[PDB]
């Protein structure tokens, strides 16, 4: 098998990790196991640190410097690999003992535990005029050499490595997302009944969604237009909480439903990136450097409140209804329904990306 | 004043 490696500019430090993608399960995290090779020909400083940093990266609204960011930390953990910590006593993984067998006594193991309820790796799509760093939530492993923990780390004496926390679709499919709504009008006696359902609960990225639509028009009115939209909801709880609703795909069929008749049709929508490069704020899966990545996977929560960015999806079905009569244009005539579903990647049967 | 790229080394099987 293979492993990843990255060296500092001055060569004194070389960080080794076993993989870049770490599977987030329900509550447990996979361990972050690796080694740090410290060359003793240059070591004298008697203390080598490795630091795990969970940071929220964002760009400043008042600065016109593309790519200029600041990182607000959400979780920081440190381990002193050399010399072995007097308190820390941890078992080595099989991978780790193999790494020690390869490098020799100069390889010092380090193992970080990422606590649960932390945000997964999410990258916000940059705008048209920013080419630098990617904003959002990202991870960074920084191993460095210093006299103590307070000193400002010189970049030539350091190495940073981006890693990602990802999630995969649950093995057992949930119950079918269904939703109905009943609009009773004031001046009308018969109600407007709208039924919609999805074919299943878990979808993969780029997979068609089949919308079973049943319209029961017991009214005197006529359904003039059907608006379907997939909207990605992102809740970002950091300083305050914000929300927005952004349509990422849509089709508006002009299919009309006459009075006292039924309707049945299958609509097929696919959310994709190709027609969305011009938008701002769209959530994408974490980037290693600057390569394109797909639409953000659904966030799996634990029943408390979680820091960071929580992503979800709902399908909206909107009927545009004619006006006139007694109340003119005073009363709105729209009918909506919302359908949450799960959008995640299938579990890799063979190898990680 | 720079940084090396992320490479990829060997690891024997057992």
């Amino acid at each position, epitope marked *: 098998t293979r492993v990843f490696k990255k*060296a500092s*500019p001055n*060569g004194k430090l*070389t960080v080794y990790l076993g993989k870049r993608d770490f599977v987030d399960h329900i509550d447990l995290v996979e361990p972050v196991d690796g080694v740090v090779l410290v*060359d003793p*020909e*240059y070591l004298k400083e008697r203390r080598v640190y490795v630091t795990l940093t969970c940071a929220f990266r964002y760009g400043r609204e008042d600065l016109d410097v593309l790519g200029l960011t600041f990182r607000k930390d959400l979780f920081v953990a440190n381990v002193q690999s050399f010399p072995p910590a007097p308190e820390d006593k941890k078992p080595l993984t099989r991978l780790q003992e193999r790494l020690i067998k390869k490098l*020799g006594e100069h390889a010092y193991p380090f193992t970080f535990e990422i606590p649960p309820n932390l945000p997964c790796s999410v990258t916000l799509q940059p705008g048209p005029e920013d080419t630098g760093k990617a904003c959002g939530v990202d991870y960074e492993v920084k191993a460095f050499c210093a006299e103590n923990l307070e000193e400002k780390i010189h970049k030539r004496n350091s190495v940073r490595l981006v890693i990602r926390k990802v999630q995969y679709a649950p093995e057992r499919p949930g119950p079918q997302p269904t939703a109905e709504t009943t609009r009773q009008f004031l001046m009308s006696d018969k109600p407007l009944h709208l039924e919609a359902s999805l074919d299943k609960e878990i979808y993969y990225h780029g997979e068609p969604i089949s919308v079973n639509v049943h319209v029961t028009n017991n009214t005197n009115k006529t359904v003039k237009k059907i608006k379907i939209s997939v909207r990605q909801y992102a809740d970002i709880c950091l300083f305050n909480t914000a929300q927005y609703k952004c349509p990422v795909a849509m089709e508006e069929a002009d299919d009309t439903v006459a009075p006292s008749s039924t309707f049945c049709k299958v609509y097929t929508l696919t959310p994709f990136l190709a027609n969305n490069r011009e938008k701002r704020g769209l959530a994408l899966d974490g980037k290693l450097k600057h390569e394109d990545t797909n639409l953000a996977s659904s966030t799996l929560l634990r029943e408390r409140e979680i820091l960071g960015i929580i992503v979800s999806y709902k399908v909206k079905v909107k009927l545009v209804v004619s006006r006139g009569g007694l109340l003119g244009d005073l009363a709105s005539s729209d009918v909506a329904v919302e359908l949450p579903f799960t959008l995640m990647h299938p579990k890799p049967k063979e190898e990680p990306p | 004043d720079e940084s*090396c790229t992320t490479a990829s080394s060997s690891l024997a099987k057992d």
Partner: nanobody
Framework: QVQLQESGGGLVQAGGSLRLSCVVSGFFFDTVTMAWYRRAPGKHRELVAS???????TYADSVKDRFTISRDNAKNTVYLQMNSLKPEDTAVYYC????????WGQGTQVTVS
């Protein structure tokens, strides 16, 4: 750009000798290690190295007592003398170092009969 070139090495009869050298290209070679590795035919790539400046004669004890491992400053190279060469001495020798974690050259190659 990074140029590296193991120099010499070829046909050798047992109980003879060799000489090898390699030069790094580009780096400001002021304070440094020389993290030499060496391979073996169809094997895990392993360490035999020494010689930072200032008196380092270190070894992985398979190959002690025989190799005048020796660096250089002005040429920016570092050498390898060999003696009385074993069927385990026959291998493919690199001159790596994790200054830039140098992707290696192609390796010289020897034989014992």
């Amino acid at each position: 750009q990074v140029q590296l070139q193991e120099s010499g090495g070829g046909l050798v009869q047992a109980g003879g000798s060799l000489r090898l050298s390699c030069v790094v290209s580009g780096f400001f070679f002021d304070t440094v290690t020389m993290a030499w590795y060496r391979r073996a035919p169809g094997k895990h790539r392993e360490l035999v190295a020494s010689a930072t400046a200032g008196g380092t004669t270190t070894y992985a004890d398979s190959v002690k007592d025989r190799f005048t491992i020796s660096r250089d400053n002005a040429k920016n190279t570092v050498y390898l003398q060999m003696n009385s060469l074993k069927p385990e001495d026959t291998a493919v020798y690199y001159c790596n170092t994790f200054v830039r974690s140098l992707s290696w050259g192609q390796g010289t190659q020897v034989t014992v009969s």
